[PDB]
Design a binder for this molecule. Structure first.
Ligand SMILES: [Mg+2]
Ligand SMILES: [Zn+2]
Ligand SMILES: [Zn+2]
Ligand SMILES: [Zn+2]
Lengths: 171, 123, 126, 90, 52, 274, 477, 78
RNA sequence: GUGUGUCUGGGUGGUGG
């Protein structure tokens, strides 16, 4: 999940920043641009504290801008299959369970769960709650769940989680 | 019968041909002048490569198509829905916008119609 | 197309080195601290602090010395870095639970040795 | 003399007498797009398609057709921003 | 010459197909004739005069 | 009946020693396909047709709803059963379950906003659904009304729309504004509406309840005639010359002189009409 | 545009594979209906499929959501009932056919042989040359494999006759069958790339159809669409005849006519064969005719093309100008424009130029803002629009001192087009110093001249540093 | 080791003047005291005489390598 | 209390430098 992986980004820089603080402007622009991406594969980015090198500044012909190819190790936000991660829940719907990992809005289907857990709509907080309160799946509690699927829709990072395995949660 | 008033002509930006997007022909149709082959030869003789590039590509028929990086075929681009698909090699990510003359796109499309695959790559 | 049970990764993601939940917690804390030490920066995004407090809730350790020590001990055996970080963030109560958690572990490590290292990391837990 | 010499050398640099025709110029490995620009465009392009010939885009003619800055006079080099020299600015 | 053609199918029941003077040319209209062509439709000729 | 199987749909095998193998359709044929799909790490080629096979999309992908109540919606389904299929869609937050017959990868897309159309010469509207088969446009009273491209009589938007409020603010086309009161007011909005007393609030989110609202503008807060006339130049160097004005501005005008081929630009103070 | 912009380092050529064409075409199931429309509704699967491109102005595509300018058109395909020889690759088809075995479908000379390996090693590196020597040495009779003697292949128009010396008409099905089972290594040593040019791909089992951009319409129709209509009509007739009639002679005649139609779609200059002559009394203009001519596509639109920002008027003498100066009429200067980038240095001057408007000559025409939008000054916009800010671009008219390239045809030598400085003058002729009449070979007996206004400051600077009249008084010839 | 000529060609000068003019046009900071000249091209020529153009020229050798030369490192044609 | 569609495609002939 948290991989210290090199990431390549291209900086298009206006000539107004061709001053004594040119490279500082390059770094600031990279920090402002790269953060918060919701592309299908790479997703959210954590690379403020790390830079490998800044490539040479190639002046594009016919355009005032300049290309600064910057290499740097980065932390990616990508989906995967067949592994289980510590998770904390968010607001839960009636039949579908919404859990959250970082900013990623994970989802869980109803009948995929083992029968020791069932929804109780008569409960005051609408959330996945067991009758005996053995494990309560509600907002802001520690749980465990696996992820197998990947999802993209108009560059909105999405995924579906599963909890077919038992014994997971406060473990 | 020849006067200057029947021969003076100027054009900045106006109508274009339908098939290729280059400017039209003639001053009756307000078409602009042909930067012919020998003009290109004279401009490379100058070495004014930027002026030649502007005249041929930029001043006549600028265009840009999205092309897949794996196979050099132009990819479907839906810019407003912000998705770019190279349907044919199962690619949705390795898509690159490439600036070319409209006549070059036209030529490559007829070559594709002739079963030739003008696979263009940035590699 | 990616699968964890066979421990198959893409070409790019394979060569990367995985870092623990406490490691990203420490790096996020350092990034936030130097953000407080920054030269008049703009307001940060919700995604950053959301991930930061999620890592804070997932945290099991707080001192860097123990992190360095556990990183030193966990590379001794041929335990892949993804399942290494998974075990560090999870830390179940027995070897069978780890085996049922990550299905790649099954066969690679015996139950006795796996229970030994699990008990060791549980004793080192503070 | 330079232009005469350059003509003679160009048409005798391949050992045989390279006639300035369809028959000499289009037999060299200059690239499919330059040859198609010169003469018998369809024949050259179909032969290239059959033989998988690739154009490395090193000539002026190919880049001209593709609209890219030619390797000619003002395009035979790159310009790099001297970031250190920009530190003297104000 | 003001000429409009009807459309097969509001604000825009017709399409304007008027003929305009040539863009670079000016002058004084000096002779306008209206007559009928070979097959009976209306047919006009307009002579424009330009002192050079 | 008909066998309407679409490429991009996944199938599952029931019989044989090749049970529960899912592969992506790569070609389509009439009734007998003998397809060679890409199963999960299968080193053997299977040629089996689509007659017995059933349309089940794979794990975690996105599908589209063609028929049913969610007509034209993109759904994401994770369920392996014969008569129970569950989705979380984007148009609908309240969770209902849709039948697999109305699930395929058709090109109906309900992910969309703000497109301007005209219903009256003065009154305009904001569309909510962007589809080729149902053009549903909102109306300020809190309903949804269907329209069509040929029934709308499109008029070019005039960019002189300056909506104004009672808090003495100043706002124009493509501006963000707020309101002190409202259930889901107080968010980012793009204002492009041609009127003075009402202004629509814009959201690109879910369009059922929490993506549209409007209230009266009392509560909003911040953040030519001379063409063709025959004129006589009664002043200046060109005095007495006769012409017809072609281009007339507030200050100057362009005059088509009758006596010469030149068309001069003269101030309107030196122009006297006939 | 969220995709990374980049140049083209190389262009690989090849032959589109039939399966690649099938999975590339937007027309799933192929084009089956010759009719272009149904009661005015553009018929899907016809020759004006809305998925292929954009039907009309202010219309949107279906494959993409681009408009007429945005959409670069998308391809369709026709699945052919029977294959046909691609007339373009015909000679290549004969050469590969004679190189390989008719029955064994193997190379007539085995690649495993050490002496033959040495022979091809002398020629490794060049595909066409390797194929040429392979053809030259086979020009053998018997294969190793089966010892059946190969036939002699001959062409009569479009069909192929295989003469054993039973002369049979070699159908394209048989050629496709032969080429299908040739190995990739055999293909490589044969002189064809197996990745890009497999032997079975020249025979046309799937015919691509271009987008509507290649074959536009007004309600006139491009002749390319007419040929496509003929091809698909013949193809549907062939499909029905195979399904129902199944008579060999009518099948053969229909296949011959199908070959003729696809060939005439590609090349309409076959000797002996009839011209694809339309009902209008006009011969066709095929794809080969589109590409080959001087007025065609390469020489007519790629190498040299019509340009904007150009002027032409007769030239008259003017001894008062300098050699590097050129007289320019007021109307010509007022018509074309040079896009000036707004700076705080010239904000006041450019604001005045904007205020003066396009009506008065020393004014402007457009204002390209920082967002890429341009506003016309002929439409008299509100002064809030006319407020200039730094970074905007103002298309002021051509003022004095502007650098122009001044060209006279025929453009013989380097001095035939030269940089000149603009001086505004009353009357309607360009003016030249009498000294520059010699490099241009220009007289003043009605000579016209072509002016070119470089649009970017980079182009202006390079013309100023390279092509000005003083800089090129001395010629290298 | 740089083996290309220390002189700066007319093509190098034309290109560097053009791009420096384009940069000064969109408000890149100047590198010379301005007497008051307005158009970017004359200002760029002034920087050229001052040898204060902050652009590295990468001359591409036919063997595929290159040689980076600063404008200050080269010698003016005039 | 506004605003873009400008009959294409061939052929023939004459003409200017
Ligand atoms: Mg002459
Ligand atoms: Zn591709
Ligand atoms: Zn399209
Ligand atoms: Zn054989």
């Amino acid at each position: 999940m948290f991989y210290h992986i090199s990431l390549e980004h291209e900086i298009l820089l206006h000539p107004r920043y061709f001053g004594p603080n040119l490279l500082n402007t390059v770094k600031q622009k990279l920090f402002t641009e790269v953060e918060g991406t919701c592309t299908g594969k790479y997703g959210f980015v954590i690379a403020v504290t790390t830079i490998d090198n800044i490539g040479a500044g190639v002046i594009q012909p016919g355009r005032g801008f300049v290309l600064y190819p910057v290499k740097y190790k980065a932390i990616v936000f990508r989906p995967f299959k067949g592994e289980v991660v510590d998770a904390v829940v968010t607001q839960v719907n009636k039949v579908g369970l919404f859990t959250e990992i970082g900013p990623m809005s994970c989802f869980i289907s109803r009948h995929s769960i083992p029968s020791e857990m069932e929804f109780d709509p008569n409960s005051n907080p609408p959330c996945y709650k067991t009758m005996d309160e053995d494990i309560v799946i509600q907002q802001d509690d520690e749980i465990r769940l696996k992820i197998v699927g990947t999802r993209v829709d108009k560059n909105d990072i999405f995924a579906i989680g599963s909890l077919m395995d038992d014994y997971l949660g406060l473990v | 019968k020849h006067m200057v008033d029947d021969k003076i002509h100027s054009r900045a930006r106006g109508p274009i041909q339908i098939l290729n997007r280059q400017p039209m022909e003639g001053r009756s149709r307000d078409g602009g002048l042909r930067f012919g082959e020998m003009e290109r030869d004279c401009q490379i003789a100058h070495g004014a490569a930027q002026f030649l590039r502007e005249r041929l590509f930029e001043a006549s028929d600028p265009y840009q198509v999205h092309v897949c990086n794996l196979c050099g075929i132009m990819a479907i681009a839906n810019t407003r829905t912000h998705t770019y698909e190279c349907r044919g090699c199962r690619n949705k990510t390795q898509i690159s916008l490439v600036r070319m003359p409209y006549a070059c796109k036209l030529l490559f499309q007829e070559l594709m119609s002739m079963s030739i695959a003008p696979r263009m790559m940035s590699v | 197309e990616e699968d964890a049970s066979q421990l198959i990764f893409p070409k790019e993601f394979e060569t990367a080195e995985t870092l623990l939940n406490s490691e990203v917690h420490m790096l996020l804390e350092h990034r936030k601290q130097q953000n407080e030490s920054a030269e008049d920066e703009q307001e940060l995004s919700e995604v950053f602090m959301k991930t930061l407090n999620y890592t804070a809730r997932f945290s099991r350790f707080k001192n860097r010395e123990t992190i360095a020590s556990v990183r030193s001990l966990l590379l001794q055996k041929k335990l892949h870095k993804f399942e290494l970080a998974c075990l560090a963030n999870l830390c179940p109560e027995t070897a069978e639970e780890s085996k049922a958690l990550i299905p790649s572990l099954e066969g690679r490590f015996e139950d006795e040795e796996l229970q030994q290292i699990l008990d060791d990391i549980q004793t080192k837990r503070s | 003399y330079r232009h005469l010499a350059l003509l003679c050398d160009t048409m005798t640099c391949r050992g045989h007498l390279m006639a300035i025709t369809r028959h000499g110029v289009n037999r060299q490995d200059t690239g499919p797009l330059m040859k198609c620009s010169f003469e018998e465009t369809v024949d050259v392009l179909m032969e290239a398609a059959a033989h998988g010939e690739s154009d490395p885009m090193k000539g002026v003619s190919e880049n001209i057709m593709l609209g890219q800055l030619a390797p000619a006079g003002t395009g035979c080099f790159d310009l790099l921003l001297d970031a250190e020299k920009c530190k003297y600015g104000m | 010459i003001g000429k409009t053609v009807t459309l097969p199918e509001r604000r825009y029941t017709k399409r304007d197909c008027s003929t305009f003077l040539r863009t670079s040319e000016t002058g004084i209209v000096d002779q306008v004739m209206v007559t009928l062509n070979q097959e009976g439709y209306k047919f006009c000729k307009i002579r424009v005069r330009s002192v050079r | 009946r008909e066998h309407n199987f679409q490429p991009g749909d996944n199938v599952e095998v029931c019989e044989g020693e090749l049970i529960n193998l899912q592969g992506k359709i790569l070609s389509v044929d009439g009734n007998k396909i003998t397809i060679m799909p890409k199963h999960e790490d299968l080193k053997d080629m299977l040629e089996f047709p689509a007659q017995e096979l059933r349309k089940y999309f794979k794990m975690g992908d996105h599908v589209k709803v063609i028929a049913g109540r969610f007509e034209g919606d993109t759904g994401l389904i994770v369920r392996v059963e014969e008569n129970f299929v569950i989705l979380f869609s984007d148009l609908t937050m309240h969770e209902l379950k849709v039948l697999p017959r109305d699930l395929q990868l058709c090109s109906e897309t309900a992910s969309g906003w703000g497109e301007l159309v005209q219903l009256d010469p003065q009154t305009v509207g904001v569309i909510v659904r962007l589809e080729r088969e149902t053009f549903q446009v909102l109306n300020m009273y809190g309903k949804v009304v269907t329209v069509r491209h040929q029934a709308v009589t499109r008029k070019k938007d005039n960019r002189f729309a300056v909506a104004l409020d009672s808090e003495q603010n100043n706002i124009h086309v493509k501006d963000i504004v707020k309101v002190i009161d409202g259930p889901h007011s107080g968010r980012e909005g793009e204002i492009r509406h041609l009127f003075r007393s009402f202004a629509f609030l814009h959201c690109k989110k879910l369009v059922e309840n929490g993506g549209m609202f409007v209230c009266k503008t009392r509560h909003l807060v911040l953040a030519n005639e001379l063409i063709g006339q025959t004129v006589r130049i009664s002043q200046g160097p060109y005095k007495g010359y006769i012409g017809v004005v072609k281009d007339a501005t507030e200050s100057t005008a362009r005059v088509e002189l009758h006596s010469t081929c030149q068309t001069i630009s003269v101030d309107r103070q030196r122009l006297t009409t006939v | 545009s969220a995709c990374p912009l980049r140049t083209i380092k190389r262009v690989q050529f090849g032959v589109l594979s039939p399966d690649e064409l099938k999975r590339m075409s937007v027309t799933e199931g192929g084009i089956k209906y010759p009719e272009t429309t149904e009661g005015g509704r553009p018929k899907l699967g016809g020759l004006m499929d809305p998925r292929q491109g954009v039907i009309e102005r202010t219309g949107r595509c279906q494959t993409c959501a681009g408009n007429m300018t945005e959409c670069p058109g998308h391809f369709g395909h026709i699945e052919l009932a029977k294959p046909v020889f691609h007339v373009g690759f015909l000679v290549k088809t004969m050469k590969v056919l004679r190189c390989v075995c008719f029955f064994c479908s193997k190379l007539l000379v085995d690649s495993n042989n050490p002496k033959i390996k040495d022979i091809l090693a002398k020629s490794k590196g060049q595909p066409k040359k390797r194929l040429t020597h392979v053809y030259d040495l086979c020009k053998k009779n018997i294969c190793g494999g089966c010892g059946r003697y190969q036939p002699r292949i001959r062409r009569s128009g479009l069909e192929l006759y295989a003469e054993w010396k039973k002369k049979i008409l070699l159908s394209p099905e048989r050629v496709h069958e032969i080429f299908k089972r040739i190995s990739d290594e055999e293909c490589f040593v044969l002189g064809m790339e197996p990745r890009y040019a497999r032997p079975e791909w020249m025979i046309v089992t799937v015919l691509p159809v271009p987008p509507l951009s290649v074959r536009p319409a007004v309600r006139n129709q491009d002749d390319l669409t007419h040929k496509l209509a003929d091809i698909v009509k013949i193809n549907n007739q062939l499909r029905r005849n195979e399904q129902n009639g199944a008579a060999a002679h009518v099948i053969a005649e229909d296949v011959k006519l199908l070959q003729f139609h696809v060939a005439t779609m590609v090349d309409n200059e076959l000797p002996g064969l009839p011209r694809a002559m339309q009902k209008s009394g006009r011969p066709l203009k095929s794809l080969k005719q589109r590409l080959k001519g001087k007025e065609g596509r390469v020489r007519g639109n790629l190498m040299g093309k019509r340009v904007d920002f150009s002027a032409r008027t007769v030239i008259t003498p003017d001894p008062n100008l300098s050699i590097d100066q050129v007289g320019v009429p007021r109307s010509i200067a007022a018509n074309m424009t040079f896009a000036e980038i707004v700076t705080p240095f010239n904000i006041d001057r450019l604001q005045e130029l904007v205020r003066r408007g396009n009506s008065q000559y020393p004014g402007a025409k457009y204002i390209i803002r920082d967002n890429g939008d341009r506003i016309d000054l002929r439409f008299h916009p509100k002064p809030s629009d006319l407020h200039l800010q730094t970074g905007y671009k103002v298309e002021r008219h051509m003022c004095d001192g502007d650098i122009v390239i001044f060209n006279r045809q025929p453009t013989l030598h380097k001095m035939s087009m030269m940089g000149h400085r603009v001086r505004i003058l009353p009357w309607s002729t360009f003016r030249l110093n009498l000294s520059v009449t010699t490099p241009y070979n220009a007289d003043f007996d009605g000579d016209e001249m072509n002016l070119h206004l470089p649009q970017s400051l980079e182009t202006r600077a390079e013309i100023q540093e390279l092509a000005m009249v003083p800089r090129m008084i001395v010629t290298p010839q | 080791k740089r083996i290309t000529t220390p002189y700066m060609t007319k093509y190098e000068r034309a290109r560097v003047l053009g791009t420096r003019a384009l940069q000064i046009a969109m408000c890149a900071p100047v590198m010379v005291e301005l007497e008051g000249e307005t158009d970017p091209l004359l200002i760029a020529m002034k920087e050229l005489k001052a040898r204060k153009i902050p652009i590295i020229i990468r001359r591409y050798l036919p063997d595929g390598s290159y040689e980076d030369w600063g404008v200050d490192e080269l010698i003016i044609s005039d």
